[PDB]
Design a protein around this ligand. Structure first.
Ligand SMILES: Nc1ncnc2c1ncn2[C@@H]1O[C@H](COP(=O)(O)OP(=O)(O)OP(=O)(O)O)[C@@H](O)[C@H]1O
Ligand SMILES: Nc1ncnc2c1ncn2[C@@H]1O[C@H](COP(=O)(O)OP(=O)(O)OP(=O)(O)O)[C@@H](O)[C@H]1O
Ligand SMILES: Nc1nc2c(ncn2[C@@H]2O[C@H](COP(=O)(O)OP(=O)(O)O)[C@@H](O)[C@H]2O)c(=O)[nH]1
Ligand SMILES: Nc1nc2c(ncn2[C@@H]2O[C@H](COP(=O)(O)OP(=O)(O)O)[C@@H](O)[C@H]2O)c(=O)[nH]1
Lengths: 447, 86, 447, 102, 55
């Protein structure tokens, strides 16, 4: 099961360079020829580079459209090993709030735990639960998360109360009878003593009995259930956001960075503009820690200009999902190849209708694929559910989590047939002529 | 009986009634009490309007026959070799 | 009171008796005319009699088909105020097991609580919660539901355990440190102490510290979340099972009675048989506490024999060259049955809300949903992605039946409001009295 | 926003000469690849030469068909920056009258 | 017979804005410029397979 049985010498097939050396191709114009299998598909590494410094376990990105990606969608994507791009069809404050909802969902130490005054009614606690999905409210002097811990409120503390106008001080669990930990605590010790606690929450108090931070058992369980979540150096879910390149958007970017985005995705049908070029340089000079994915491109000429400005990644697509544009398969292969030579990953955006098209798009050179329409009916989308004849406009596809798992197994099985245990491996063998294709006549496509 | 000067006839779920019968029945009753009636809905061509007036309605209410005209609210656009209002 | 405004003296409409005096009709042949409104649609009682002694808050019954009603579906129906009929395309024991799932899911005093011996591994508890969905396992001498109480195992006692082979006694919470109660106590007081303790479970022990029964906080919340659940005299969800009427099926009926069915439903294409007459008589003689829904009938002649044999309820519906239009059959059979104090179940042909409304209006007390429920997640089957669609097998995915049932409830109320009565019981009576009036529709009057 | 950012050196694309060097093409057989933008579309000069000595602000001409171009159509076209061709499905005097009307 | 398209004036304005937006994407501020750059190889095209046209 070694190199001798895997390396093609006969090379009966067509290389990508030959395949894309003529008229522009759709994904249905070609097919990938099988290779040599010595491994179960469960072992296939599907990972791709979203940007220079960000590797995604699942090479899947949710589109920045107001019908697809908001907080809930972005959370789901990061949980499964990919990432979401919060859309920019909202006010600056609204988009920043969505980013915080994603960033602050998972964390190890909760730095600004949600706190209330002892006088607030149970109704506001229940509202916090239904809207923000946060239990374990800390009751503190003044309501400021800054300390003076008086008690905590959990679901079993309010579920039986009939007068929602009652102060939480009546029903909360009071500090006198609470298990807490003092300031110099390491996270691993803190989580261990919490699990021993058999409680959901462990406040960390300073010597004045003030709240420095909070530990949540829900975060422990989330790690166990989603071991491949896309996380940053601080244990938060990764979150991208989209903006245009106009001058007014600079304020929007600043608020987005202050809210914790890890990647900035530029919004333009064609991104090869003096405006996008300036914007990238300004983002790089002002927010170096931020990574920029540059506007939509279809030609190496466009890709050169945006890469020169400092773009950490490129979004590929035009006329894919007007006499100006380019067929997606060709556009991906050409741009992704040029960008690879400059060490820049690429995102396939548009034309990805099924699992097979996503496989081809990665094999031909895209590091990660952007899902717009494949995700349209899932329950993490911003829309609302209604019954015309069946649902709960588009069709209800269920939970995006189950769909992402289905795509993941799809990619793994396609990689197994192609004969490589890695999509990094597939992309390299495609450039080398060891992964071969076959253009299909139109008749061959009908059958 | 509450004081209406006129009545809108038309309805259509599992509740409603065929439009031609409703106009005739309601208009006939209303006429005996000196109250006119407005045929509302289901008036797609001239013949329907004629029939509705003939069967008792004093006046017809045009919704869809008027939908595209330029005096309606909305803006014009060119979708596919067509001028449309939306 | 607005009797002068609501009672029709002009009577501009067709009575149900005139409407069904001619050729057989289906629900699209006629429309219900509007009445008089002086109430919000929220205040409409849609309840109907499933059988002589069973009133359903929601007049909906899930069909006894292997693709519709098993334990989960029957739970969902009962919780929403309807009921479900476990299908009989299974073995006796499998059908009995499903009945038990329904009956013992919601209940006040848990009588044979799932207990364990101290030597059992953490693995089995995870299995208990996974396979059966129960998280209050009691640790007892000998692992017997009636043995000395030694501890409880709940979710947070197992969150953190890496060697699942470990004994459950290592991580349980010892009886030494549990808040419990003594045998002679009342359910009202037991739930009050349970709510005050902030725990999930409260064991009731005898004077030897042997376990007598168990109180679950989940049943308390299920009561709040589903205040209209179809309950029996002991606080369990109502459940119904189907059977055939041949001699072999007597063993099945004995099994279902022991498993706790509240309604026996006879399954037949045509129920007007000597075999069903004898079966009904036998069920009533040997199992007096069982109500029976008699086989599918379409005519009063058939209804007379099954009612005369002792049926508590009738299933209306049939459709070969033998059958009858569904709307006529419901009206005729229900009208005859009503004069003898027997409710009727509209079975089949109920594709939208309006049909359900019309079926209730024309005499049916309760409607049986087969296809409207076919795609919901509480039906048996697995989900798959065929072509950009989530399907169960096939049919399209309709989401949760709970949300659908609420939709139908709101629909029934709204159409009741137009008809001008605060009750479907009123609608049925006023139809028979000629105050609710219909109109036959000519064919060209379709839409 | 100068020549360095606009001139293609990589030349990733197909020239018109290559594109039309084979079987005959309809307009749907090809697509124009994008370039480099440093200006609002409001500034785009769409003008074309109708003839050697006639430059049209709008490069649009109405067909000389009896169902399309008579006086009114020809007037509208010239107003918007283009031109109309009065059709010849009429007597000489009738067509001349339409021209005078324009 | 055909459908009423309204005033040719409004249609000519729509086409005018269409051409201006297509020229912007192509990257030239003039159609005289586009035609010359096409002859020079600085405006490039891409033939589309039949499948690529269906999508
Ligand atoms: N650090 C603590 N010390 C003492 N008691 C605590 C502590 N944290 C939580 N409690 C309380 O212990 C009891 C058990 O926890 P809890 O109600 O959270 O279970 P739960 O159903 O999972 O609710 P939640 O959604 O908040 O986790 C509650 O009354 C809670 O207020
Ligand atoms: N009667 C009791 N006395 C003492 N401890 C108890 C009692 N009942 C449960 N506990 C323990 O309280 C702790 C918290 O209970 P827990 O929240 O895990 O119950 P639960 O019903 O499974 O709620 P949930 O699943 O929503 O978190 C656990 O260690 C549990 O073993
Ligand atoms: N007490 C508590 N706080 C949490 C928990 N999880 C997250 N938080 C924090 O609680 C805050 C809730 O959001 P918030 O600041 O009120 O949103 P805003 O009002 O729109 O600015 C955030 O700072 C979260 O980080 C939890 O489980 N318990
Ligand atoms: N510990 C515990 N037992 C429950 C709960 N709800 C129901 N039960 C009981 O647990 C049992 C269900 O499992 P069981 O019938 O023993 O499975 P079987 O061995 O296949 O018959 C029944 O005795 C129920 O009454 C709960 O919440 N906690």
């Amino acid at each position: 099961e070694n190199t001798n049985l895997r390396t093609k010498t006969l090379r009966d097939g067509t290389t990508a360079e030959e395949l894309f050396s003529q008229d522009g191709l759709s994904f249905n114009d070609f097919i990938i020829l099988p290779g040599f299998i010595d491994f179960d598909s469960s072992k296939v590494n599907v990972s791709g580079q979203f940007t220079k410094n960000i590797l995604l376990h699942l090479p899947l990105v949710s589109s920045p459209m107001d019908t697809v990606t908001e907080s809930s969608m972005a959370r789901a994507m990061a949980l499964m090993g990919g990432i979401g791009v919060i859309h920019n069809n909202c006010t600056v404050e609204q988009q920043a709030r969505m980013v915080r909802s994603v960033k602050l969902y998972r964390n190890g130490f909760i730095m600004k735990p949600k706190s209330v005054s002892p006088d607030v009614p149970v109704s506001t606690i229940r509202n916090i639960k239904s809207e923000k999905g946060i239990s374990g409210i800390l009751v503190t002097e003044g309501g400021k998360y800054d300390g003076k811990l008086l008690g905590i409120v959990c679901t079993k503390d309010i579920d039986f109360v009939k007068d929602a106008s009652a102060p939480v001080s009546q029903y909360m669990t009071r500090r006198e009878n609470m298990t807490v930990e003092r300031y110099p605590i390491k996270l691993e010790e803190a989580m261990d003593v919490l699990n021993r606690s058999r409680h959901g929450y462990l406040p960390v108090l300073n010597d004045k009995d003030e709240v420095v931070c909070l530990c949540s058992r829900r975060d422990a369980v989330r790690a166990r259930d989603y071991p491949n979540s896309s996380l940053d150096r601080n244990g938060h879910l990764l979150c991208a956001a989209a903006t245009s390149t106009r001058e007014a958007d600079k304020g929007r970017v600043a608020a987005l960075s202050e809210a914790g985005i890890d990647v900035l995705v530029l919004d333009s049908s064609q991104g090869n503009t003096i405006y996008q070029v300036s914007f990238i340089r300004w983002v790089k000079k002002t927010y170096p820690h931020l990574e920029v994915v540059a506007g939509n491109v279809v030609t190496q000429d466009q890709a050169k200009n945006l890469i020169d400005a400092g773009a950490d990644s490129l979004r590929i697509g035009m006329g894919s999902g007007l006499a100006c544009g380019r067929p997606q398969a060709t556009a991906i292969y050409k741009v992704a190849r040029y960008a690879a030579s400059r060490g820049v990953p690429c995102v396939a955006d548009g034309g990805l209708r099924n699992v097979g098209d996503v496989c081809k798009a990665l094999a031909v050179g895209a590091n990660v694929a952007m899902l717009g329409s494949m995700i349209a009916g899932t329950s993490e989308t911003p829309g609302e559910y209604f019954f015309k004849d069946g649902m709960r406009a588009v069709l209800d596809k269920g939970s995006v989590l189950k769909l992402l798992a289905y795509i993941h197994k799809g990619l793994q099985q396609s990689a197994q047939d192609i004969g490589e245990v890695s999509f990094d491996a597939i992309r390299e063998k495609v450039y080398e002529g060891q992964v071969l294709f076959n253009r299909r006549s139109l008749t061959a496509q009908s059958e | 009986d509450a004081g209406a000067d006129s009545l809108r006839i038309g309805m259509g779920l599992a509740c409603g009634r065929p439009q031609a019968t409703a106009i005739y029945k309601v208009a006939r009753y209303a006429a005996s009490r000196g109250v006119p009636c407005v045929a509302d809905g289901g008036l797609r061509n001239v013949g329907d309007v004629c029939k509705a007036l003939a069967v008792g309605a004093n006046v017809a209410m045009l919704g869809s026959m008027i939908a595209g005209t330029s005096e309606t609210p909305g803006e014009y656009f060119f979708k596919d070799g067509m001028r449309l209002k939306g």
